[PDB]
Structure 1
Amino acid sequence: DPAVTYYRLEEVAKRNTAEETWMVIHGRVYDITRFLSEHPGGEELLLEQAGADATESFEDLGHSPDAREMLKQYYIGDVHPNDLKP
């Protein structure tokens, strides 16, 4: 039994509202539903990319190592190997 749960992007794409917000960052899936109201950068920016891969924006805006440590707590699984971009 693998120690990691894998999610297809089709599944992630479904959680795209404030009720259940999932997001992909660097090949990993995060459930940031409860973090929406605590995000220093506001929640409109987040909701816009819910259900998607927001890796580019997360790096582009430059996030601190402190922000990256935070991420760890919303981690729920990895993107399925079939949906990774070689």
Structure 2
Amino acid sequence: AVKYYTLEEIQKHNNSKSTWLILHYKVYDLTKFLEEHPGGEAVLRAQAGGDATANFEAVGHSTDARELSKTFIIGELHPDDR
């Protein structure tokens, strides 16, 4: 099924193990991609656990990168949040 995640639940995934984040109300686990991500782990980590939409777009990310993101899609932002 799809499953949605609350800001809370996503928040708990900001550290040492699980880097989740929200881009455009869509939740992405990239925790295993930290080193792999050619923008550094640190910035992903720092932005983990919440809205990183503005950060993501402010940096800017190609079509490839946008499509890549979907491969790391776990679900969406809970309809209670938005």
Task: Decide: shared fold, TM above 0.5.
Answer: yes
Matched, 1:48 2:46: yes
Determine which of 63, 67, 70 is the counterpart of 2:68: 70
Greater percentage in helix: 1
Local SS of the residue matching 2:27: strand
Percent identity (aligned):
56
| 1:47-83 deviation digits (Å, cap 9, x = unpaired) | 0011111000111111111110110111111111110
* Alignment TM-score, normalising by the size of structure 1: 0.89
* Alignment TM-score, normalising by the size of structure 2: 0.93
Which stretches in structure 2 are left out of the alignment for 5+ residues? none
Local SS of the residue matching 2:34: helix
- In structure 2, the partner of 1:80 is 78
Give 1:18 shift: 3.3
Work out the CA distance in 2 between the residues paired with 1:5 and 1:42: 28
Work out the CA distance in 1 between the residues paired with 2:62 and 2:81: 27
Runs of 4+ in structure 1 off by over 2 angstroms are none
| 1:11-68 deviation digits (Å, cap 9, x = unpaired) | 0000111311111110111111111011111111110011111000111111111110
